[PDB]
Amino acid sequence: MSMSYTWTGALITPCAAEESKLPINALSNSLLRHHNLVYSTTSRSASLRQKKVTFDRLQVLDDHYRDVLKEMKAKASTVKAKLLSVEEACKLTPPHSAKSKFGYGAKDVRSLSSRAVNHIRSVWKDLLEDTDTPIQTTIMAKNEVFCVQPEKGGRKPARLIVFPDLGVRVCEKMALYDVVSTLPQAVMGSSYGFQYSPKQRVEFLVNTWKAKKCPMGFSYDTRCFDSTVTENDIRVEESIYQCCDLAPEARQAIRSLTERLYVGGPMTNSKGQNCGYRRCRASGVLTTSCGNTLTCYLKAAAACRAAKLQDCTMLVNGDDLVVICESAGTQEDAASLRVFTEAMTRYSAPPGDPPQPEYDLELITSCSSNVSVAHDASGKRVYYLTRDPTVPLARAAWETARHTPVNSWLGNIIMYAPTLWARMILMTHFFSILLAQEQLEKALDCQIYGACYSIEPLDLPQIIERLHGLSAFSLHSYSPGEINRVASCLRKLGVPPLRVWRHRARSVRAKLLSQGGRAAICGKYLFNWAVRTKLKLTPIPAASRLLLSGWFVAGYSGGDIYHS
Ligand SMILES: O=C(O)C(Cc1ccc(Oc2ccccc2Br)cc1)NC(=O)[C@]12C[C@H]3C[C@H](C[C@H](C3)C1)C2
Ligand SMILES: [Cl-]
């Protein structure tokens, strides 16, 4: 019986200028034409999200709960985590990270400047000596682009982001970075979804589905997960971390950061005004992904035991949960789900949209995607993940008409490379401009699982072949449903139908060819689909000579992480 937030009256303010509408770049229209369906959320709607996230939490724990928890601790107690030298942690800080309120900035932290490392050290020392005073935090409204869908009641309010000053953030890395990158995997084995690259996630889903006599799966959408995480949920997370073999110093920091940061604390807007008090999960700390995954898995697994799902498998990614089990008859299934929801609700994690049993894999949506099918060169059946490309496109359009620090279009191209909307529209549309500006060599930033990475377009082919396999360049005969969903979308937004992109693709693939080197290996593999005479595509050598290690290991959303 504790509120997720208390508010003072202070508005959530923006620090910069917030553009809500698409500018009208002549280039933007080379992609999307109905630029009035595209929109970005601003701190103008923050008060609506505030109502949504502010609620009371009732939570009753039980035997199933305690049994699973105990099993988790057991596995946790077999993990050993080290600390991180100020230096080591400083390197994990993104070049563009928010500057500290204490004189220095991101580059100063990255460049191990003196003033910075001195504050970072005073902060660390303060964590060891004071284990009670609530650390201060800032609450900003996020600004993400979407498309207008009248079927949902128009537009959606901006999401909130709550984070601590850069000093603290670098400490968090020193104390927990190694833990949140190892504890998760060790406690929930194969259920931990961040250990998989696209090719592996698909493989884990299909295999698990096909491994059931009469498969039955569902996705469980939790209404505002972060807001439901109770203080006991966070102290429980801590007790799990504490199971690891930690340095007496790392233990004091972890305990101190839990009591002072994670379990809640006060918030101020950009103007330094007292905004409110948080008593639920902070969206912008390092343990956000690890914490949500651990806690989402804990409750879910215990609910499976109250509902009696038969031989079930779970795949968790933060607050995103998908469950596949053995069917017990459509009616018994519907009922096992209602008890599942009832158990979850008791664990302080009610849902938004109530879960619904599904019997067709390709009709399940987890991590905003679904399995679909296509065929490789030798006409073999190949599975891959995809989604409605509306948002992806509406954003790929906004990022063409306004410069953005991190661009999703490159993340989508990588993660959804085998899809047809990514290959015929994204690759085509972008490698296009990266020629009308000669930037095939210029590295660009993008996020994956939260971690930030610097990637060069000219390396996409090797990368893709690594996450999706070589088939991803020769997939044909896509399922009609999919082909149709994309086409339907393109018509909605105003994006030239697939045929137009086929033409553009042949062209682009050309200027890229009559440019040889690497720009021609991209036009060769990334566009072998826009030419009748299809050249033979074989294993890329420079595809092995690349370690994508850090990539798919753990999740770091809101963790202010930068991988190099
Ligand atoms: O922010 C995150 O924490 C985050 C998590 C995430 C988890 C599981 C996924 O499983 C899938 C789902 C479909 C295909 C393959 C795989 Br493994 C995909 C993404 N998003 C991104 O990494 C992304 C990467 C790229 C593409 C999207 C949007 C932005 C840019 C954020 C997800
Ligand atoms: Cl179909």
> DSSP readout, 131-190?
SSSPPPEEEEE---EEE-BGGGTB--PPPEEEE--HHHHHHHHHHHTTTTTTHHHHHHGG
Q: Is 415 in the pocket of ligand 1 (CB under 6 A)?
A: yes
Between CA 101 and CA 449 the distance in angstroms is: 27
Alpha-carbon span 492 to 37, nearest angstrom: 9
Angle of helix 480-493 versus helix 390-401 axis, rounded to 10: 40
Which among 547, 551, 514, 510 is positioned nearest to 527, based on CA atoms? 510
Is residue 529 in contact with ligand 1, taking CB distance under 6 Å?
no
C-alpha dihedral sign at 415, 420, 423, 425: negative
Measured distance CA(198)–CA(121) in Å, rounded: 39
What 3-state class would DSSP assign to 545?
coil
Gap between the Cα atoms of 311 and 298, Å rounded: 17
**Ligand 2 centroid distance, CA of 474 (Å):** 19
The separation between CA 134 and the C-alpha centre of its own chain, rounded to angstroms, equals 28
| 205 and 315 Cβ atoms separated by less than 8 Å | yes
Residue that has been written with the tokens 């191990």 in this structure: 112
Ligand approaching nearest to the C-alpha of 481? 2
> From ligand 2's centre to the CA of 502, what distance in Å?
22
Nearest to 164 by CA among 284, 264, 8, 15: 284
For the chain, the structural domain boundaries read: 1-56+134-164+264-279, 57-133+165-188+230-263+280-286, 189-229+287-367, 368-564
Rounded distance between C-alpha atoms, residue 540 and residue 528, angstroms: 14
| Bridging pattern class, strands 2-3 and 38-40 | unpaired
Q: 24: left (phi > 0), else alpha (psi -120 to 50), else beta?
A: left
Instruction: Tell me the resolution in Å.
Output: 2.8
Q: How far apart are CA 460 and CA 410, in angstroms?
A: 9
The residue among 39, 51, 50 whose CA lies nearest residue 12 is 50
Which pair of tokens denotes residue 133? 């005073």
363 alpha carbon, closest ligand:
2
Q: Regarding beta strands 444-448 and 310-317, do their DSSP bridges make them parallel or antiparallel, or are they unpaired? A: unpaired
Hey, what amino acid is at 489?
C
DSSP 347-398: TT--BSSPP--BS-GGG--BTTBEEEEEE-TT--EEEEEE---HHHHHHHHH
> Is 249 in contact with 131 (CB distance < 8 Å)?
no
- Solving technique for this entry? X-ray
- Does the domain formed by 189-229+287-367 have CATH 3.30.70.270? yes
From 314, 366, 449, give the residue whose CB has the most ligand 1 atoms within 8 Å, as the site to mutate: 449
E strand or H helix at 484:
helix 480-493
Q: How far is CA 551 from CA 307, 469, 472, in A?
A: 35, 16, 19
Cα separations in angstroms, 515 against 218, 434, 502, 522, 542: 49, 13, 20, 11, 19
For residue 374, list its beta bridge partners: 382
In angstroms, how far is CA 456 from the centroid of its own chain? 21
Three-state secondary-structure class, residue 416 = coil
Q: How many CB atoms lie within 10 A of CB 509?
A: 23
Q: Which element (helix H / strand E) includes 217? A: strand 215-220
Distance CA 257, CA 168 (A): 9
**Are the C-beta atoms of 266 and 274 separated by less than 8 Å?**
yes
